[PDB]
Design a protein around this nucleic acid. Sequence first.
DNA 1: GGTTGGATGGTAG
DNA 2: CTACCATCCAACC
Length: 341
Amino acid sequence: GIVLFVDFDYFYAQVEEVLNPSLKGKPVVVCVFSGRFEDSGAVATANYEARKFGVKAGIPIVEAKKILPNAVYLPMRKEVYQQVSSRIMNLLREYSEKIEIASIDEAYLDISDKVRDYREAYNLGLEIKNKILEKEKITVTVGISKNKVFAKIAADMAKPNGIKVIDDEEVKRLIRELDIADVPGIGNITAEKLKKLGINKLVDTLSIEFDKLKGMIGEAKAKYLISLARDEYNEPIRTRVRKSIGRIVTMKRNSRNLEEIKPYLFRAIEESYYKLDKRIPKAIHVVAVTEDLDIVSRGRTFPHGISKETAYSESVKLLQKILEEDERKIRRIGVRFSKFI
DNA sequence: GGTTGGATGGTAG
DNA sequence: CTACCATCCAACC
Ligand SMILES: [Ca+2]
Ligand SMILES: [Ca+2]
């Protein structure tokens, strides 16, 4: 009946500002340095000082630095970030046990058991915001509404250190006036594909045939946006189990030579097993990105869990199969584990 | 309809 | 960039 969603503001860039106060009120850019050349890699997150001028997540470093020399570029630290994140989800757990952790910086709380209306929800939302800022020193945004999507949207509306309630009549005006672009779970690839055809707002999805929408953007997205445009979305705050853990690393030059790829592949296995942590996958996949960024996978499922040395030995054979089947040089190599027990 | 195989495609931090 | 998931096109119990 009532959902409370929490989103950590510019999370990666914020931990850095808290750990290292020499940085605040300044542009701060968290990067992934691929490993190849100088500036090799992409922006992973950026504070709002860096974002006003187009330095945002996804873009390359050599484009961020030409759009802003100036700023503070920082190697990513997912361990450090994950530490803080685990602690914050633990606080949130005490306000309600029904919690959907959707990612390192997002969570959904169903509070239809703890409050009576939205007014009691807003009070609780400020309270959670205040405890987090006191214990961790992190500003967060809270969205409140009737289903998950509208709680997230409300947070998207309030973003930098904000709180927002989207009640019932506001939900209805949003269906007619909200762009498809601003819908959680709908990226710029889908938005602009629909944009071409005049599908601009959420209500427009109810003006088009289902197979026409399906044949354009696929199954889930078609039913998803249709539910929402009618107001028939209210799926439960379900727990999230990771389906797969894998690592990919970039070589310093393209190679079709078995013995030269091996060191990188083995370095992926080590870090991947690190991440599994007491989990035991029944299945494994090797991923190679070739010369012209083309993706090739071979994997294998087992009637038992895979030991660390079995992976070494099996991953070598899956890399062989790729090399006999594809005559192109490989540029990045990695492994994926799934079908846990 | 279920498992398992492999392919680009998409969303997000 | 990296991480993780989805979509689809396939064989076959
Ligand atoms: Ca987020
Ligand atoms: Ca299928």
